[PDB]
Amino acid sequence: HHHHTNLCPFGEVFNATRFASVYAWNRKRISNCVADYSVLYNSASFSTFKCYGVSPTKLNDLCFTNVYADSFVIRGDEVRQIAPGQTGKIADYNYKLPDDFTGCVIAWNSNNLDSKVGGNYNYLYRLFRKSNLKPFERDISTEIYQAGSTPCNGVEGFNCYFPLQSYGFQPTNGVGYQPYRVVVLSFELLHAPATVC
Amino acid sequence: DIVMTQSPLSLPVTPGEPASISCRSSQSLLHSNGYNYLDWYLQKPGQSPQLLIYLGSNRASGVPDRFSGSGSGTDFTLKISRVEAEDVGVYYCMQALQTPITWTFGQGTKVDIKRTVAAPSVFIFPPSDEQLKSGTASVVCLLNNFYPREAKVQWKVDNALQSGNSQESVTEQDSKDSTYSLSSTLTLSKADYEKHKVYACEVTHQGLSSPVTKSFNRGEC
Amino acid sequence: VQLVESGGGLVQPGGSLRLSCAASGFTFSSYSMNWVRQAPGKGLEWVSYISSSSSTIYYADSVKGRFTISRDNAKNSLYLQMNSLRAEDTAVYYCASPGGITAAGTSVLFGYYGMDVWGQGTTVTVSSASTKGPSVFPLAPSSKSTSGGTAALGCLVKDYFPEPVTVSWNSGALTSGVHTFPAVLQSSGLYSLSSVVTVPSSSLGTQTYICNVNHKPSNTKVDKRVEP
Ligand SMILES: *[C@@H]1O[C@H](CO)[C@@H](O)[C@H](O)[C@H]1NC(C)=O
Ligand SMILES: [Cl-]
Ligand SMILES: [Cl-]
């Protein structure tokens, strides 16, 4: 039982036990399935559902050559950085959206899924980088970051920090320090006359 | 080097009523930070193990309200407030104090659907003469649609108790009547089969007020 | 499912094979990994542990000097090299990921929260036995093989390797009241199961009963009549 008319299982994949750290954000190609974006948009499940370059009311009657689903986990404070032309630690060193971004940003609180009473220190974020990330770039290197003045010689220590730090996701956190799951849809439209699409 | 002791081995449960499993450790599992390094896992039939409780008493993701862990130091317990059909499986506890050097599990606790007692219908099958020509002879005894699973079959050949020459295997609980069925296969060389006359299958089961004996003679109908 | 084991199969004692566990959907490099096996019938047994940075490795006493665990974070995969295999290594091998991270040089999981992600498992059977088709014999019904209005009968699927076999009755027309039993590993190293079914005792002559036995590993399909 499998057909290209099967609806894309967004419900199942979104509900996964674990997501990727924002610094190594995971990217899927939605292919050979029917994506009904009204089922997401009209499910009151998601806190953030903001689209850019496209009206979300008319996602279902558009033609897409290529659809990308970028997924990761950040804190609720940082969800406002998942937008074009934003600044901060995430947008600059983890996940940058371009100014001409044509897609949708979907986010929802995942406290019950990603927070652990022991403390969940496995979701990471990048804290230092020589330059800001170009849009849709992904940096997973672990080179020892040089503060600015004195050399590091590839060894950690004073003014020489490991570029990745762990989030501290416990369920007693404030809403702003609680983990939020983010899914970012990237659209490629079909060059075609109005008469067809 | 910490020994886990689960109790009971089997535990029938009524859907809609509570249930409790116990896990005892040979040494305290309470760490100096105030956490009890003991996890609970569930292995639904024909499925991977599933995490239920972590750090002694905290539910993993997605686990319904019904489940709850408790206990400290050396004696811990699971508690399902309302058992429901899908909870059937094997529940293992695991100490995590000595991670990542040793990861010690318990024996597990098989969970049945509780139902009224059911005496097994016993049927015996002589070795077919088609098989008889191979060289071996398999006598088969069938306990059919019974509960609970605890059942003892004994093979007597001319009233002599046979041991270490037969194997048995039981079906998993049926989803409509919650019963088991058990086949015992007495295997003997054709020579040994012919030299004895009365082959009997002796069944002891809780549902039977008295042990049932099914027997036959080599030549009958 | 976010972890997927592969490579398991049939192997002769003293031989070797390698298992592979492929992560997808999360950052494999951020978690530590475990191999956990379950022998047929028996319970869960931990095998080995590898840290996130692949820097702290522990095996169990039973597999030391024989199994070696390794990981390749660039390929989001976990490896287990199983050398000098014994028959008792037959088991379903799971890969699972405990939560937490290692600090400094001392291996200890901080903020532990259990093995929240388990694979689907891959099956490894260690046996020198040779592939063989089954010998199907009938368990014919009698009159002292009838209880109180119904009658039992069945097929004995004996001596075959490896698992599994499929058994239907009347090519699937007979389903109610069937009981195909779990196979048993005989002393010889061959498998043997039985399939039985309770039919009405008033239809032994008017109804044909034929079990259909299929053993794909030997291409052997056998249909047997069960007559009084
Ligand atoms: C995740 O699954 C639960 C039940 O399994 C469901 O209630 C929920 O709506 C799902 N999440 C989404 C985003 O649909
Ligand atoms: Cl605790
Ligand atoms: Cl902790």
Three-state secondary structure string covering B98-132: CCCCCCEECCCEEEEECCCCECCEEEEECCCHHHH
Alpha carbons C26 and A103: distance in angstroms, whole number:
23
Cα–Cα distances (Å) from A24 to A146, A170, C117, in that order, read: 21, 21, 19
- Annotated domain spans of chain A: 1-118+171-197, 119-170
How distant is the Cα of B91 from the closest Cα of chain A, in angstroms?
A: 21
Resolution (A): 2.9
Q: Hey, which CATH number is domain B4-113, 1.20.950.20, 3.40.50.880, 2.60.40.10, 3.90.400.10? A: 2.60.40.10
B121-217 in CATH: which number? 2.60.40.10
Alpha carbons C198 and C161: distance in angstroms, whole number:
28
Only one residue has tokens 């239907």, namely C168
Only one residue has tokens 């100014």, namely A99
User: Which residues face B138 on adjacent strands?
Assistant: B187
DSSP secondary structure code for residue C89 in this structure: G
What's the CA-to-centroid distance between B13 and ligand 1, angstroms? 28
Alpha carbons B179 and A67: distance in angstroms, whole number:
51
Q: Would you state the structure tokens that stand for residue B95, as one six-digit string?
A: 């100490």
The residues, ordered by sequence, that sit 6+ positions from C68 with a Cβ below 8 Å of its Cβ are C80, C81, C83
Alpha carbons C207 and B90: distance in angstroms, whole number:
41
Backbone angles phi, psi at A76, to 5 degrees: -55, -35
Q: Residues A78, A94: contact at Cβ < 8 Å?
A: no
Alpha carbons A68 and A27: distance in angstroms, whole number:
7
> Which burial class, exposed, middle or buried, applies to A156 when counting CB atoms under 10 A from its CB (0-12, 13-18, 19+)?
exposed
Pocket test for ligand 1, best of A45, A48, A111, A114 (most atoms within 8 A of CB): A45
Q: Residues C29, C50: contact at Cβ < 8 Å?
A: no
User: Which residues face B123 on adjacent strands?
Assistant: B142
Q: Residues A45, A52: contact at Cβ < 8 Å?
A: no
- Annotated domain spans of chain C: 3-126, 135-225
The residues, ordered by sequence, that sit 6+ positions from B21 with a Cβ below 8 Å of its Cβ are B6, B7, B8, B11, B77, B78, B91, B93, B109
Question: In chain B, which segments carry CATH 2.60.40.10?
Answer: 4-113, 121-217
Chains sharing 3 or more CB pairs under 8 A with chain A: B, C
Which three-class secondary structure state does DSSP give residue A57? helix
Alpha carbons C98 and C110: distance in angstroms, whole number:
11
Q: Residues C222, C136: contact at Cβ < 8 Å?
A: yes
Q: Would you state the structure tokens that stand for residue C163, as one six-digit string?
A: 């698992």
- Beta strand extents in chain C (DSSP E only): 3-6, 10-11, 17-23, 33-38, 44-50, 57-59, 67-72, 77-82, 91-98, 115-118, 122-126, 135-139, 150-160, 166-169, 178-180, 184-185, 191-200, 210-215, 220-225
Residue whose C-alpha is closest to residue A190's, from A57, A63, A105, A77: A63
Alpha carbons C102 and C31: distance in angstroms, whole number:
9
For the four alpha carbons of A74, A80, A82 and A85, in that order, the dihedral sign comes to: negative
Domain at C135-225: CATH architecture: Sandwich (2.60)
Determination technique used: X-ray
Alpha carbons C228 and C225: distance in angstroms, whole number:
10
Q: Using CA atoms in the order C108, C113, C117, C123, what is the torsion angle rounded to 10 degrees?
A: 60
Alpha carbons B80 and B67: distance in angstroms, whole number:
5
Top-tier CATH class for C3-126: mainly beta
Is the CB of A42 inside a 6 Å radius of any atom of ligand 1?
Answer: no
Assess whether the region C3-126 and the region C135-225 belong to the same CATH fold.
yes
For the four alpha carbons of B139, B144, B150 and B152, in that order, the dihedral sign comes to: negative
Q: Residues B67, B53: contact at Cβ < 8 Å?
A: yes
CB contact under 8 A, A117 and B62: no
Alpha carbons B133 and C133: distance in angstroms, whole number:
18
DSSP secondary structure code for residue A40 in this structure: H
CA atoms within 13 A on the CB side of C92: 17
Chain B residues inside the 8 Å CB shell of C110: none
Alpha carbons B97 and C210: distance in angstroms, whole number:
56
